[PDB]
Amino acid sequence: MSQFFIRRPVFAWVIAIFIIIFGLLSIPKLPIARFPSVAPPQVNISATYP
Amino acid sequence: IAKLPKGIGYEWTGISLQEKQSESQMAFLLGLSMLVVFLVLAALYESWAI
């Protein structure tokens, strides 16, 4: 049942504004890169005997 | 320090750096609180101006 939000337009617009504000705050802080960390992590031991 | 010749830079550390960081963010964390109060009250009144 959603008659409450048709009865309350200000209430719906305020939740929409909350969502927009948090999204705009979050967007700059998000990292940006072409691909995610799909590749398995790798650890490399190195040794040298001249 | 602005009067010193070129090539000398001042870095704040310890308590002073924390003081600067606290002072910088005051306006953001007052304005955001005011906006949050505005939005919550508007939600609970169904009126933008109340």
**To what resolution in angstroms was this structure determined?**
3.6
Expressed in percent and rounded to 5, the helix, strand and coil fractions of chain B are 60, 0, 40
Smallest Cα distance from A35 to chain B, Å: 33
- In A, what residues contact B, Cβ < 8 A? 8-11, 14-15, 17-18, 21
Q: What is the C-alpha separation between B39 and B48, in angstroms, rounded?
A: 9
As a whole number of angstroms, the distance between CA A34 and CA A32 comes to 7
A23 Ramachandran zone, left/alpha/beta (phi>0; psi -120 to 50)? alpha
CB–CB of B21/B13 below 8 Å? no
| d(C-alpha B12, C-alpha A44), whole Å | 39
